[PDB]
C-alpha cells in the first residue's frame, strides 16, 4: 500500500547466515535484527514490486539501522537504487557515496548523512523513485562496502523502509 517494509530476514545480506560474521538477535519489541560482527564484503540488498504501491507517488527508500559503540570502517559506503529493467547489460552496481558512521560535524558539510528517526533508530536514504502506474517493474536497492582490505563492523540492520516523500 502506502509504501513497504522489508524485514531484515527478507533482505539478501551476504554471509548473514554465518554466525562468525553476523549475529541474529531479537530486541524489544520482539523484532529480529542482524548485527554485523565482522565482514569484509558488506552487501545489504532488497527488492520491491512497484505494482503494490500507491500510484502517482514519489517514494524514498531508507535502510533502518543502529550503530554499536565501536563501529569500524563504516565512515562511508555505497548506496544504490535503480529500476531492475533500466540496468544496461554489463553495467555494474552504479551507486552513490553516502555516510554511515561518520557524524555531520559541520552545518555546511555536503553529503547524505543518516537521520535519527522518532523511534530511536537511524536511517540512511538509499535512493528515490517515482511510481507512475506501477507498470515499470521492480525496484532494487542496496548498501555495500566491499573493500577487501578492511573489516567492517558495528551496524545493526533492521530493514528497508520504503516511504512516500
Phi, psi of 8 (to 5 degrees): -55, -40
* Grid cell in block for residue 137: 517493474
Please work out the total of residues on this chain that contact Zn ion, with binding judged by CB under 5 A. 5
Q: How far is the CB of 23 from Zn ion (least distance, A)?
A: 22
Q: How far is the CB of 2 from a copy of itself (least distance, A)?
A: 16
* Grid cell in block for residue 4: 513497504
Residue with Cβ nearer Zn ion (17 or 138)? 138
| Ranges assigned E (strand) in 8-152 | 12-13, 22-27, 31-36, 42-49, 57-72, 76-83, 96-99, 115-116, 122-131, 138-145
Selected binder of Zn ion within 54, 87, 111, 164 (CB under 5 A): 87
Which of Zn ion, a copy of itself, none does 85 bind, CB closer than 5 to 8 A by kind?
a copy of itself
Give the interface with a copy of itself as residue ranges (CB under 8 A). Answer: 56, 58, 60, 76, 82, 84-89, 91, 94-99, 109-112, 128-130, 132, 165
3-state secondary structure of 49: strand
Amino acid at each position: 500500500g502506502q509504501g513497504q517494509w522489508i524485514a531484515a530476514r527478507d533482505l539478501s545480506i551476504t554471509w548473514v547466515d554465518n554466525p562468525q560474521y553476523w549475529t541474529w538477535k531479537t530486541v524489544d519489541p520482539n523484532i529480529e535484527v542482524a548485527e554485523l560482527r565482522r565482514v569484509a564484503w558488506l552487501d545489504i540488498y532488497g527488492k520491491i514490486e512497484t505494482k503494490n504501491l500507491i500510484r502517482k507517488t514519489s517514494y524514498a527508500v531508507y535502510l533502518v539501522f543502529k550503530l554499536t559503540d565501536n563501529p569500524r570502517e563504516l565512515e562511508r559506503a555505497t548506496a544504490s537504487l535503480r529500476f531492475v529493467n533500466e540496468v544496461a547489460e554489463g553495467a555494474g552496481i552504479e551507486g552513490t557515496t553516502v555516510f554511515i558512521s561518520k557524524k555531520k560535524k559541520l552545518p555546511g558539510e555536503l553529503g547524505r548523512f543518516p537521520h535519527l528517526r522518532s523511534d530511536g533508530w537511524l536511517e540512511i536514504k538509499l535512493g528515490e523513485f517515482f511510481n507512475n502506474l506501477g507498470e515499470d517493474g521492480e525496484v532494487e536497492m542496496r548498501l555495500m562496502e566491499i573493500n577487501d582490505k578492511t573489516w567492517k563492523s558495528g551496524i545493526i540492520v533492521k530493514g528497508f523502509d520504503i516511504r512516500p516523500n
